Design a protein around this ligand. Structure first.
Ligand SMILES: Nc1ncnc2c1ncn2[C@@H]1O[C@H](COP(=O)(O)OP(=O)(O)O)[C@@H](O)[C@H]1O
Ligand SMILES: Nc1ncnc2c1ncn2[C@@H]1O[C@H](COP(=O)(O)OP(=O)(O)O)[C@@H](O)[C@H]1O
Ligand SMILES: Nc1ncnc2c1ncn2[C@@H]1O[C@H](COP(=O)(O)OP(=O)(O)O)[C@@H](O)[C@H]1O
Ligand SMILES: Nc1ncnc2c1ncn2[C@@H]1O[C@H](COP(=O)(O)OP(=O)(O)O)[C@@H](O)[C@H]1O
Ligand SMILES: Nc1ncnc2c1ncn2[C@@H]1O[C@H](COP(=O)(O)OP(=O)(O)O)[C@@H](O)[C@H]1O
Ligand SMILES: [Mg+2]
Ligand SMILES: [Mg+2]
Ligand SMILES: [Mg+2]
Ligand SMILES: [Mg+2]
Ligand SMILES: [Mg+2]
Lengths: 369, 7, 366, 366, 369, 369, 7, 7
C-alpha cells in the first residue's frame, strides 16, 4: 500500500492510497518555547509540532518550515515528516511507497533534498513527486482544463488539453493565503485591534477563514458598507472580547483580484488565467475556456467561484462560454488526485526505486517526474 | 494595552 | 468487387467501385504530439492519421506526406493507406483489386514504390495506377475534351480527341490550393492577422474554402472595394473581417507572378495546350473544356475562363466550359465507372505479372 | 532527608520534607529586655527568640528581622535560624539539605547572604532557594494558574501556564498583614483605645486575626454599621468593642489609598497581571486563581475577589478563585512536595559548587 | 501664520511655523491631587497640567493621556491642547492653521476625533495632520532614505525613495522610552532601590536620560562589568541619598536590540530595519542602505548609531555600504520638518479648510491625509 | 539635413544623416509611478520616458509601446518620438525630413498611423519609411546577400540579388531577444533566483547581455557543464547579492536554434535562412550562400557567428561556399545604412513630401514605399 | 498577443 | 523572501 502525503505550506494532509479523504490533517508548524520553565517532573520535552503546537500557542514560537512553496528550514521539516509518519499515521516507512508533491516552477534543490531525505533518512522502498495542479484533474476525472490552484503561499495555473500539458503557458503567482492573513492583520489595525505575534496570526487566520467573503462589485460594496448596514460580524476572541469587522471583510480577498494592495506589480488571478489561456493554441482555447478547475484552500470563499466567471467574461470573446468548476470538496482535491493516481496499475512502473537511487543519486527526479 | 482589543 | 482510391495531395477519397460517391473522405494528414504528456490513463497512440489529427489540431504537428503530387515520406503514407483500408472501410486488401491514381509527368519512382507497397505489404491481387485527368473524361462520359484538373498539389491539362491522348500537348503547373493557402496566410498579414503554425494553416484553408471567390474584372473589383466585406469567426470566439483579400487569393491562378512564378495562368496554359495540337482538333477542343478538382469550385472560376480564353481565341470559335457541380469527386466517379468494365477486367496487373521483372511492369502496362 | 524551612516574615514555618504540616510554627521576633533586672539567682540570658519572647512579652522589645521580605538584620536572623535548627527541630544541619524561600523581585544580596550563612556558619551539605508562589502552585498539584501570596510584608502574583512562568508579568505589592496591623492600631484610636508599643502591636494582631473580616459591598456594610459589634478581652480583664473597624482594616487590600499608597488593590494587580499574558493564556488564568499566604484567611476575600474580578474580566469568561482551606501552610506543603521528587536531586547547590564559584552561583542557578 | 505642534506621547513640542526650534517644550501629564488639602486660603487647585504637574510632583497623580501613540483619554488631552495654545504659546487658535502629527498604522478614531476637536472646540481655520517619519526626512532635506523614529511609545520605520513612500513596508513597533523606563525601574529592584509610584517614574526616567548608554558588544560589556570597573555612576535622588548603578545602564537600552527581555516576540530595531529594507525593490535597496535617518528621543543614547551600523553590516551584503546618519538636533527633527513643510508655497493648497469640514464632517481626513 | 531614426522595440537609435554613429541611444520604455508620492515640494512628473525611466526604475512600471515590431500603443509612442526629437536631439522637426523603419510583413496600420503622426503632429516637410533589412545591405555596401536582422521582437531573412528584392522569399520569425529574456528569467527559477517584475526583467536582460554565449556543440556543452567545471560565472545584483549561473549561459540563446523551448512550432534561424535561400533561384543561390549578412542586437553573442556557418554547411551542398558576414559594428548597422541612404543625391526625389501627402491622405505610404 | 488575431 | 535571491 502506498502513502499519499501532501506537504502544504500551511497544512499537512496525509493518508493512505486508495481512500477518499486524508487521514492526517494538521498544520505545518513547529513550536519552540520562549519562556523560563520552572517546574520539575514536567512533560515539556523540547519542541511541539503540528496540532500539538496549537494547544500550547501562548508559550510557543510558531515557525512555518515551508514558505511560498519552497522549503527553508530542513531540520524541522524532517520533524514534521517524522511526526506525520509515526505519531499521526503509525506506519513504518520502510514498507510503503510515498507519493510526494511540489508546486511547479520551484527550485530544483527541493526535489533532490526531498528525495535524499525520503530515501536515506526514512528508507522508503519507492517514491514519486508529482505536480499539484495535475492532480486536481485526476480528482475531477476530466483530462481537459486549466487548473487554478491556491492556498498558503502559491497560486499557479497549469493548462492541460488532452493529457498533454503546455509548460510554456503555466503561470505561478505567490499571493495565496499567507499574504491575505498578513494583509488582514494589518488592515485590522485601523479599526483598533492590534494583532502582532505568531500566536495572534492564528487568531487572524481563524477570523479570515470564517467571516471573510469575496465581493462581486467591489466599488458597489465599498459604498454599501460605508453606510451603516448589515455587514458587521462580531467575532469572539479566545479571551472573551468581541470585534466587529464590517468593511474589512471583503477587502481581505480582494487583494487576490487586485494585487496592488501589497504593492505587487502582477495582475490578479482572473488575469493570470486569461493570459495562461491566451498563451495556448486556438483549438485548445475553446475547451480551456469551458473547464476552469479550482483547487486549494484559498478558493473556498463564498464569492470567487461566481466572480471569476464575471471577470473572465469581461475579457473573453463574446461567443465563448465559461464554466468555473467548483467541486465543493475541493480543499483536499490535490490529495484525492494522489490517492487516485497511486492506486493505478498503469502507474506502478513510474516509481523511483531504491536501486535506481543508489546508482543515480538524488539527481534522478529531474529526469523522472 | 490601550488599543481596542489586544495590547 | 474492386477498390478505387484517389490519393490526392489534399484529402484521400476512397470507396468501392461501381458506386456513385466515395465511401469516406478525410484529409491526408499525419500529426505527431509535440508536448509532454503527463497522464497515465490516456494521451496515447503516438501518431494520429487522417481525421483525428484534424480534430486535435492544438497538440499535433500536422505534416502532409504528398507535396505537388510526389510522395516525400513513405512511412506515413503507409499509415494513411493502412488507415484508409482498415479503419475506414474494414476490408482486407487481399480480397479486392485496388485502383490507384497519379498525376501526369511524375517521377517513375512513385509508380514503382507504389506498386511495391501495394503488392509486398497489402497483398493486393490486382492493382492499376491510372492518370487523374482521363478519369474526369470517363466521368463526364465524353471522349472529346481538355481536362483542367486542379487539386491541392498539381494542375495539368490533358487533351483527348476521341481516345488517343496527345502526350506532347500536355502541360503541368504546380500552382494549386496549397500554394493559394500559403499566399492567403501571407496576404492576411496586412490587416493584422498572423497565422503561423500548421494548425493555423488548417484554419486559413477553411477561410479560403468558403469566403474566396474568383473576380471577373480584377482592376474593377480592386477599384470597387476601395462593400465586399465578410466576417469569419475563428474557432476560439474571435472574428476577422477580410474584404479585399478574397478575390486576390484565387487571382494567383491567373497571374502567377504574385507568388513569384515565371509561368502563365490557367487561362493561358490551356490555350497553349490547345494550340500544341493539330488544326482540326481545336474546333471541338475549344467547345469541350472539362474541369475537375477542388480548386475549380470557387464562385466564378468557370465564367473567368469562358471570358478570358475568348480574348485570345479566334472570334468565329465557340467555347463551352463544362463545369459540373459534382466535380469535386469527379476523378473518383471516373474511377468507379472505369473499374466496372469487362474491357478493363482484362487490363489489370496481377500478382503473377509482378513476380516477373519486379515493379517495373507499370512502365509498360500503364 | 531534606529540610523545608519556609522562612517567612511574620513567622517561621519550618519542618521536615515529605510530611504535610510543619513541625515548627513560631513567630520570628528576637525580643530583648529593656528594664533592669534585680533578681540575681535567675536566668534572663540576653535575648529571647521565638515564642519565648511572646511568653515574656511585657518586659521586652520585639524586633522583627524581616521588613517587607528583605532581611534587615542579619545578626539575629542567624539567631532565628540557629533556634529553628537546634532548639525546635533538634537536628545537626551538617547531615541535612535545606530548602529556603524568597519573594520574587527581591534584592539579590539576600540570595548571596543566605547561601553564605547556610554554608559558612551552619555547614549545610547542599541548599536551594525557591519562590513562594511556584511552591504554592506545587501544593495544589496543578501546573496552570495565577497565584496570590500574602502575609506580613509581600503580596505578589506569579502566573504560570504549563510550567512556563511569564516573568515579565509578576506584580509585587508590599501591602500584607503588618500594614493592616499598623492601620488597625491607628484606626482604633478614634474609638478611644491607644495601642502603642510592640506588645500592643502583638495584641492588635491578635484582634485582627479573629475579629476582622472582608466585606462584600463596602458602602452597604458602612451603611449597615450605623444602626455588628464584637467584644475582645484584653489580657488584663478588660473589654473593647470594635463595631465598624473590622472590615475597614482588610478593606485596605482592595483600596490601598487608605495608607496613601498610590497603587491599586489586589483585585487590580491580578487583572493587570493577567492582562500582560497572551490571549491563549488568559482563558485559563482567569479560571485558575490560587490563593495562599496568611492574609487570605478572612471570612471575606474569596467571595469578594470573584465579585470584583468578574466586573473587570469579560462577561463570557468564568472565574474560579481556588481557595484551599489548608492554604496558610501551602508554601511549605509545596516545598515538602518539591524536595521529595527524584527529579530534583540534581537541582541542589552542592558544597563543591560553592567552593568553586562562591555565593554568586545563586543567581546563576535557581 | 501656521502652528506646528508635534503632539508627542511623552512630550508636547509646539511652536510657530517658520522657526527652527519649538517655543513650548513640556511633557504631557495631567496631575490630580491624591491627598487632602487643609488650608483655607488658596492653597491648592483642581488639576495641574504640564510642568506644573512636575513641580508639584509629590502630592499629585501623574497620568499620561497618550499610550503607545494612540490617545486614550480625550478629556485631558483637550486640557493639554488648551494649555499649549493659551498658557504656553499665548495665541488665539481661531486665526492660525495647525499642523498636527500621528504615528503610522494608528486607529482611524484618532484622525477623526483630532479633527473634530480641532474644528468644533478650538475653531481653527485650517488643519492638517502629517506623519512623523516623513517630516524627519523633510528636516534632513533628503528625499531618499529610511527613517527610524522613536520616543515614549511607538518605534516605527518608514522607507521613502523619491518621495514615493512605500506603504507596504512600514514596520511599527512599541518599544520606546516608556517601556524602557518600566524595565529600568524593574531591573533596579535587583540592586535594592524600589521605585514604585507615578511620581517615582519621573526619577527613573531621569536616571535613564543621563546614565544609560548603549554598549557595543553586549556580552563583552557584561563580562567587563563583572569586574568592578568605571561603569559605576553615582546619581543622587531629590533627597540627598545616592544610588550606584554599574551594570544596569547598558541593559535598559539593550531591550531595543533584544526585545526578548520584556517577553516581546518581535526582533530588535536593527532587524525591523533590515526587513523593512528587504521588503523594497532591488533598485531601492542600494540607496536605502546608504541613507538611514534616526529621529525621536530614544535615539539620543551614546552608542546607538555605531551599534545600529555594526548590526546592519552583518545582515546587509558585504559589498554594499551603510551610512547611519544621525544629526545632533534629531530630537526636535519632526518639529523642524513641520516648520519646513508648513512654510511652503506649494503646501497652502493642501490644508483641510473649514468649508470642507462643514460638508462632510470629520471623515475628509482619511481621503485628504 | 535629414533625420534618421531607428524605431526598434528595444532601443531607439536616432541621429543626423551623414554621420556614422547615432546621437541618441536609449531604450523605448515609458514608466508610470505606481506608489503614493508624499514629498510635496518636489518634481514628480507623471510619465518618465527613456533612460531616465531606467534610472528611476524601482518605483516605475516599465512598459514597451512596441511588441513584436508592431506598435500597440500610440499614446506613449508619441511620447518617445517627442522625447527623441526634443530632449535628446534638440532639433525642431519642422525643418528636417525624417527617415523611419519598419519590419517586413507588418500590418498597414503601422505605416498609415506612423505617416499621420509624423505629418499632422510633428509637421515634418518630408518623410520616408524603409524596410529594416535593406539598410543592413546598404551599410555593408554590397548589393548581394541575405540579411539576417534580429533584435527584440522580430527576425527577418530578406534576400537581394542585385538591387532586386525577392518578396516571395522573405521569412519573418518572432523569436528575438525579448523572448530570450523571458525564457532566461523563467529558467533562472530552477536554480533559485526568482525575477518577476519589469524592474527585474531589466536586470535579467543585463544578465543576458554580458554572460550568455551561443554553444557550438550543444550536447557536448550540456555534458561538460554536468561536471563541476569552469562554466560558472558570478554576477552581482544591484543590491549586493551575487548569483551564479553555470548551465543557463547557452540554454538561453539556444532557443534561436531550437524554438521548441518556448513552445514555438517553427524552425530555428539556421533553417529559416536555408529555406529563404532555397526559395530563390538556382543561379541566385550560388552567391546567396556566400554573402550571409547579420544585423541586430541578438546577433551579438560570442557564439552564433561560427555556429551558423556550421549549421548551414550541415544542410547545404558540399561544393558550396558559405561565409557569414558578421561585422563587429553590426548593432547600429540599420542606422548606418539609413545615414548612408539619406545622404544620397539619387534618394532626393524618393521623399514623401508634405504637398503630395494631403493630396492623397496617409494611404500614399503603401504606394510610395 | 500584439497583432489582432493570433499571437 | 524565502528563495535564494530576490523575494
Ligand atoms: N474555509 C476557508 N476559507 C478561506 N480560506 C481558507 C479556508 N480554509 C483554509 N483556508 C486558507 O487555505 C490555506 C490552507 O489551504 P490549502 O490549500 O490546503 O494550503 P496548502 O496547499 O499549502 O496545503 C490556509 O492557510 C487558509 O489561509
Ligand atoms: N469548395 C472549395 N472551394 C475552394 N477551394 C476548395 C474547395 N474545396 C477544396 N478546395 C481546395 O482544393 C484542395 C482539395 O481539393 P481536391 O481537388 O479534392 O484535392 P486532391 O486532388 O489532392 O484530392 C484543398 O486544399 C482546397 O484548397
Ligand atoms: N486567620 C487570619 N486572619 C487574618 N490575618 C491572619 C490570619 N492568620 C494570619 N494572619 C496574618 O498573616 C500573617 C502571617 O501569615 P504568613 O503567611 O505565615 O506570613 P509569612 O509567610 O511571611 O510567614 C500574620 O501576621 C497575620 O497578620
Ligand atoms: N537625552 C535622552 N537620552 C535618552 N532618552 C531620552 C533622552 N531624552 C528623551 N529621552 C526619552 O524619549 C522620550 C521622549 O522623547 P520624544 O522624541 O520627545 O517623544 P515623542 O516623539 O512622543 O514626543 C522620553 O520619555 C525619554 O524616555
Ligand atoms: N551585447 C548583447 N549581446 C546579446 N544581445 C544583446 C546585446 N545587447 C543587446 N542585446 C539584445 O538586442 C536587443 C536590442 O538590440 P537592437 O538590435 O537594437 O533591437 P531593435 O532593432 O529592435 O532596436 C536587446 O533587447 C537585447 O536582448
Ligand atoms: Mg496544496
Ligand atoms: Mg485531384
Ligand atoms: Mg509566606
Ligand atoms: Mg515623535
Ligand atoms: Mg533593428
Amino acid at each position: 500500500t502506498a502513502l499519499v502525503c501532501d506537504n502544504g505550506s500551511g497544512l499537512v494532509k496525509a493518508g493512505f492510497a486508495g481512500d477518499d479523504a486524508p487521514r492526517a490533517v494538521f498544520p505545518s508548524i513547529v513550536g519552540r518555547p520562549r519562556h523560563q520553565g520552572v517546574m520539575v517532573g514536567m512533560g515539556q520535552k523540547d519542541s511541539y509540532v503540528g496540532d500539538e503546537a496549537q494547544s500550547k500557542r501562548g508559550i510557543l514560537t510558531l515557525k512555518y518550515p515551508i514558505e511560498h512553496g519552497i522549503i527553508t528550514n530542513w531540520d524541522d521539516m524532517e520533524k514534521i515528516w517524522h511526526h506525520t509518519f509515526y505519531n499521526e499515521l503509525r506506519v513504518a516507512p520502510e514498507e510503503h511507497p510515498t507519493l510526494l508533491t511540489e508546486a511547479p516552477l520551484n527550485p530544483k534543490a527541493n526535489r533532490e533534498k526531498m528525495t535524499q531525505i525520503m530515501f536515506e533518512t526514512f528508507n522508503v522502498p519507492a517514491m514519486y513527486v508529482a505536480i499539484q495542479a495535475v492532480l486536481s484533474l485526476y480528482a475531477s476525472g476530466r483530462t481537459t482544463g486549466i487548473v487554478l490552484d491556491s492556498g498558503d503561499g502559491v497560486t499557479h495555473n497549469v493548462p492541460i488539453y488532452e493529457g498533454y500539458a503546455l509548460p510554456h503557458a503555466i503561470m505561478r503567482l505567490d499571493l495565496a493565503g499567507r499574504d491575505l492573513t498578513d494583509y488582514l492583520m494589518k488592515i485590522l489595525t485601523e479599526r483598533g485591534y492590534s494583532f502582532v505575534t505568531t500566536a495572534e496570526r492564528e487568531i487572524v487566520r481563524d477570523i479570515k477563514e470564517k467571516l471573510c467573503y469575496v465581493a462581486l462589485d467591489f466599488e458597489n460594496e465599498m459604498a454599501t458598507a460605508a453606510s451603516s448596514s448589515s455587514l458587521e460580524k462580531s467575532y469572539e476572541l479566545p479571551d472573551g472580547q468581541v470585534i466587529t469587522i464590517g468593511n474589512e471583510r471583503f477587502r481581505c480577498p480582494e487583494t487576490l483580484f487586485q494585487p496592488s494592495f501589497i504593492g505587487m506589480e502582477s495582475a490578479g488571478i482572473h488575469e493570470t488565467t486569461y493570459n495562461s489561456i491566451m498563451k495556448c493554441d486556438i483549438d485548445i482555447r475553446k475547451d480551456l475556456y469551458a473547464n476552469n478547475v479550482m483547487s486549494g484552500g484559498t478558493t473556498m470563499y463564498p464569492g470567487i467561484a461566481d466572480r471569476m466567471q464575471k471577470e473572465i467574461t469581461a475579457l473573453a470573446p463574446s461567443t465563448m462560454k465559461i464554466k468555473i468548476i467548483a467541486p465543493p470538496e475541493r480543499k483536499y482535491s490535490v490529495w484525492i488526485g494522489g490517492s487516485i493516481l497511486a492506486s493505478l496499475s498503469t502507474f506502478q512502473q513510474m516509481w523511483i526505486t531504491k536501486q535506481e537511487y543508489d546508482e543515480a543519486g538524488p539527481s534522478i527526479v529531474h529526469r523522472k517526474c | 494595552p490601550a488599543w481596542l482589543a489586544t495590547c
